[PDB]
Design an enzyme around this catalytic site. Sequence first.
Site, PDB file in Angstrom:
ATOM      1  N   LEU A   1       0.761  -1.296  -0.071  1.00 20.25           N
ATOM      2  CA  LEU A   1       0.028   0.237  -0.151  1.00 20.25           C
ATOM      3  C   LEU A   1       0.745   1.183   0.025  1.00 20.25           C
ATOM      4  O   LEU A   1       0.575   2.203  -0.681  1.00 20.25           O
ATOM      5  CB  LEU A   1      -0.891   0.213   1.218  1.00 20.25           C
ATOM      6  CG  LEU A   1      -1.975  -1.185   1.342  1.00 20.25           C
ATOM      7  CD1 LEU A   1      -2.402  -1.206   2.961  1.00 20.25           C
ATOM      8  CD2 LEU A   1      -3.169  -1.156   0.385  1.00 20.25           C
ATOM      9  N   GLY A   2       2.099   1.368   0.746  1.00 18.05           N
ATOM     10  CA  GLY A   2       2.905   2.452   0.779  1.00 18.05           C
ATOM     11  C   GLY A   2       4.309   1.986   0.723  1.00 18.05           C
ATOM     12  O   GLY A   2       4.701   1.091   1.254  1.00 18.05           O
TER      13      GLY A   2
ATOM     14  N   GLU B   1       7.473  -0.144   5.241  1.00 16.34           N
ATOM     15  CA  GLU B   1       6.572  -0.228   4.094  1.00 16.34           C
ATOM     16  C   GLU B   1       5.398  -0.812   4.658  1.00 16.34           C
ATOM     17  O   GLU B   1       5.352  -1.384   5.979  1.00 16.34           O
ATOM     18  CB  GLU B   1       7.049  -1.348   3.053  1.00 16.34           C
ATOM     19  CG  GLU B   1       6.977  -3.081   3.661  1.00 16.34           C
ATOM     20  CD  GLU B   1       6.477  -4.082   2.651  1.00 16.34           C
ATOM     21  OE1 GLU B   1       6.080  -4.934   3.107  1.00 16.34           O
ATOM     22  OE2 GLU B   1       6.650  -3.517   1.307  1.00 16.34           O
ATOM     23  N   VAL B   2       4.192  -0.697   3.805  1.00 16.84           N
ATOM     24  CA  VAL B   2       2.938  -1.134   4.520  1.00 16.84           C
ATOM     25  C   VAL B   2       1.949  -2.025   3.555  1.00 16.84           C
ATOM     26  O   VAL B   2       2.162  -1.577   2.378  1.00 16.84           O
ATOM     27  CB  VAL B   2       1.914   0.009   4.893  1.00 16.84           C
ATOM     28  CG1 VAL B   2       0.500  -0.331   5.306  1.00 16.84           C
ATOM     29  CG2 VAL B   2       2.693   0.976   6.141  1.00 16.84           C
TER      30      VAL B   2
ATOM     31  N   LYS C   1       2.553  -2.470   8.868  1.00 17.98           N
ATOM     32  CA  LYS C   1       3.721  -1.774   8.865  1.00 17.98           C
ATOM     33  C   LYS C   1       4.741  -2.559   8.995  1.00 17.98           C
ATOM     34  O   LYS C   1       4.800  -3.287  10.300  1.00 17.98           O
ATOM     35  CB  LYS C   1       3.588  -0.489   9.888  1.00 17.98           C
ATOM     36  CG  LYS C   1       4.333   0.444   9.523  1.00 17.98           C
ATOM     37  CD  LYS C   1       4.620   1.467  10.714  1.00 17.98           C
ATOM     38  CE  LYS C   1       4.837   2.941  10.360  1.00 17.98           C
ATOM     39  NZ  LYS C   1       3.707   3.551  10.312  1.00 17.98           N
TER      40      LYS C   1
ATOM     41  N   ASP D   1       2.877  15.819  12.890  1.00 15.64           N
ATOM     42  CA  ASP D   1       3.043  15.565  11.577  1.00 15.64           C
ATOM     43  C   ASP D   1       1.885  15.561  10.763  1.00 15.64           C
ATOM     44  O   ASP D   1       1.497  14.777   9.806  1.00 15.64           O
ATOM     45  CB  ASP D   1       3.849  14.591  11.262  1.00 15.64           C
ATOM     46  CG  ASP D   1       4.657  14.800   9.684  1.00 15.64           C
ATOM     47  OD1 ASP D   1       5.179  13.565   9.114  1.00 15.64           O
ATOM     48  OD2 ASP D   1       4.636  15.918   9.453  1.00 15.64           O
TER      49      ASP D   1
HETATM   50  N1  LIG Z   1      -0.928   7.796   1.892  1.00 11.30           N
HETATM   51  C1  LIG Z   1       0.054   6.804   1.843  1.00 11.30           C
HETATM   52  C2  LIG Z   1      -0.138   5.605   2.966  1.00 11.30           C
HETATM   53  C3  LIG Z   1      -1.122   4.614   2.515  1.00 11.30           C
HETATM   54  N2  LIG Z   1      -1.261   3.612   3.655  1.00 11.30           N
HETATM   55  C4  LIG Z   1      -2.394   3.118   4.294  1.00 11.30           C
HETATM   56  C5  LIG Z   1      -3.557   2.812   3.500  1.00 11.30           C
HETATM   57  C6  LIG Z   1      -3.741   3.396   2.072  1.00 11.30           C
HETATM   58  C7  LIG Z   1      -3.949   2.370   1.158  1.00 11.30           C
HETATM   59  C8  LIG Z   1      -4.046   2.827  -0.293  1.00 11.30           C
HETATM   60  C9  LIG Z   1      -3.625   4.016  -0.643  1.00 11.30           C
HETATM   61  C10 LIG Z   1      -3.378   4.922   0.248  1.00 11.30           C
HETATM   62  C11 LIG Z   1      -3.091   4.519   1.696  1.00 11.30           C
HETATM   63  C12 LIG Z   1      -4.886   2.550   3.942  1.00 11.30           C
HETATM   64  N3  LIG Z   1      -5.010   2.253   5.156  1.00 11.30           N
HETATM   65  C13 LIG Z   1      -3.705   2.171   5.938  1.00 11.30           C
HETATM   66  N4  LIG Z   1      -3.765   1.923   7.471  1.00 11.30           N
HETATM   67  N5  LIG Z   1      -2.581   2.247   7.454  1.00 11.30           N
HETATM   68  C14 LIG Z   1      -1.752   2.797   6.609  1.00 11.30           C
HETATM   69  C15 LIG Z   1      -2.593   2.790   5.543  1.00 11.30           C
HETATM   70  C16 LIG Z   1      -0.020   3.070   4.393  1.00 11.30           C
HETATM   71  C17 LIG Z   1       0.973   4.133   4.259  1.00 11.30           C
HETATM   72  O1  LIG Z   1       1.113   4.989   3.125  1.00 11.30           O
END
Ligand SMILES: NC[C@H]1CN(c2c(-c3ccccc3)cnc3[nH]ncc23)CCO1
Length: 248
Positions: free
Chosen positions: A9-10, A11-12, A27, A109
């Site tokens: 998704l993002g 590391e995530v 995460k 932040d």
């Molecule tokens: N805006 C970027 C963000 C996106 N992201 C998540 C997203 C997410 C998923 C797809 C696109 C943007 C963010 C959805 N839920 C989450 N929970 N914790 C993090 C997270 C993880 C960290 O990067």
Amino acid sequence: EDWDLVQTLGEVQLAVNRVTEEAVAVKIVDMNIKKEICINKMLNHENVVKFYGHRREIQYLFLEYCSGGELFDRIEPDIGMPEPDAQRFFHQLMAGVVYLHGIGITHRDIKPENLLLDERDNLKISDFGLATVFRYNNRERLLNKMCGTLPYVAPELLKRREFHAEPVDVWSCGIVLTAMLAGELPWDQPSDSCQEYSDWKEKKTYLNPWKKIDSAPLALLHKILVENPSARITIPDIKKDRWYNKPL
Ligand SMILES: NC[C@H]1CN(c2c(-c3ccccc3)cnc3[nH]ncc23)CCO1
């Protein structure tokens, strides 16, 4: 017990339960983190990303998944978004922030990259990696470490050795409101060497981004983006602002 890591998704990564098919976010950080977890353990609010747990294998944080994505992707560049959506998100952002400050936590932040949306477009404050405690045992500690992201950061953080936590989060919320209603950030940083910031301080609102903002939201921005953190509007007072309470 078993989760499949569908995608990054993002590391995530997005995780889906083998049996229930529930979705979560994980995460993955290989060795700040101890505090992130500590803080997450105290958080329970509908406008804050839920913390499920962690495993110390490299460390895994199990966090609420927001299929809505990030708020930045709801802002049309140079345009913004319809004022009614901006207000709703700001209402929810304020709910989230009131809660955190309520239990003595500052995010430090706040920016659209850390404001996520669930399936009903509910805003969730996310990523407490930079967060810290500013009230403990009913005692406030001023901050002195420089955290954040230059365009969202309050001016006192650049010119003062120590500062109160709450007004810093409030400034950054104002910058976010600005991004939502104008599709642009007003300045690179809140410093006098910055032309755009000097202009705002001189009330040149006929310039972008202020030209694009209706007078009611703009009057509130005039109260939030006040350089003196002591004169800056407080949240309880934002909650009484005309635009804040305007049916839309
Ligand atoms: N805006 C970027 C963000 C996106 N992201 C998540 C997203 C997410 C998923 C797809 C696109 C943007 C963010 C959805 N839920 C989450 N929970 N914790 C993090 C997270 C993880 C960290 O990067």
